């Protein structure tokens, strides 16, 4: 099944050193000659997501589904961008934009290299609120928004990544009946955890937990509480505490995203407006 507008010649692709791995594939650095149509002569440094030697049938299928999802999203400043793919005659290669600073979690943990200021943190939250606004506008739910799924480029631009669990949503709620779920519990909304319902407001909840990760410089959500005990505490109204240096205006923002009623939570459009005002006065 070839899509000519995304197919990239294998000869033009030279693989390099590894960049990371999980239990769904691996990512290697690579050189791609003429993949950028704006400069069709220069070789572009890219990242290639591919299967592993111990890959499964679902691993291949998930990588194919993540490829099709990224085709629909399009380019944005705060979203990792699909550049091409190698599907015909050989292993599936998913070629995406390269980010040299890693993922946001290890990025912030390595600044407790550089050093993070209050403006830097607010700048991070603003860009991630803009990437989700365009993502929500494109009729998409990420379902796996976390600090580890955000990439940082050489010029410190936040890139939303990991669309393996992303789905398209229309005007009503997304809903399926599952033998068991696959979303990280500590970032899930109560309706996603209990009712198996996911909307753009469920991504707002994850954004709140994402805010907590950012202002803790890479801490783990609900510190000291196992995944097993989080179930009962969410039903009873437990929320995370305010970080050490985090303005109350930004903690009320987190508590807004963490509202029980999904429709009562802010929209990503409103988060961009509020963060814009907070950022300009710094
Ligand atoms: N464009 C890119 N540039 C540099 N590193 C990248 C990258 N894209 C992904 N990576 C890194 O490759 C590593 C593994 O990739 P990926 O994030 O897709 O696996 P994963 O996180 O879904 C499995 P797990 O969560 O169990 O570790 C990650 O640490 C990620 O930061
Ligand atoms: Mg990840």
Author numbering: 469 to 580, 595 to 764
The publication says:
Receptor tyrosine kinase (RTK) signaling fulfills fundamental functions in development, tissue homeostasis, and metabolism of metazoan organisms. The FGFR subfamily of tyrosine kinases has emerged as an excellent model system to elucidate the molecular basis underlying allosteric regulation of RTKs in a physiologically relevant and unbiased fashion. Our data reveal two clusters of hydrophobic interactions, termed ‘DFG latch’ and ‘αC tether’, which relay allosteric signals between the A-loop and the molecular brake. These hydrophobic networks, located strategically at the interface between the N- and C-lobes of the kinase, sense the structural fluctuations in the A-loop and molecular brake and undergo rearrangements to determine the kinase interlobe angle and hence kinase activation.
To resolve the ambiguity surrounding the A-loop conformation of the molecular brake mutants, we also retried crystallizing FGFR2K mutants bearing single and double mutations of the molecular brake constituents. Fortunately, we succeeded in obtaining the crystal structure of the FGFR2KE565A/N549H double mutant in a different space group than we previously solved for WT FGFR2K. Similar to crystal structures of single mutants of the molecular brake, the FGFR2KE565A/N549H structure showed a disengaged molecular brake. However, unlike these previous structures the A-loop in the FGFR2KE565A/N549H structure adopted a catalytically active conformation with striking resemblance to that of A-loop phosphorylated FGFR2K. Two mutations within the molecular brake disrupt the hydrogen bonding at the molecular brake and drive the A-loop into the active conformation. Lastly, as a control, we constructed the N549H/E565A double mutant in which two mutations target the same allosteric site (i.e. the molecular brake). By contrast, double mutants targeting the same allosteric site (N549H/E565A) or two adjoining sites (I547V/E565A) gave only a subtle increase in activity beyond those of the single mutants. This lack of synergy between N549H and E565A mutations in elevating kinase activity is expected as either mutation alone is sufficient to disrupt the hydrogen bonding network at the molecular brake.
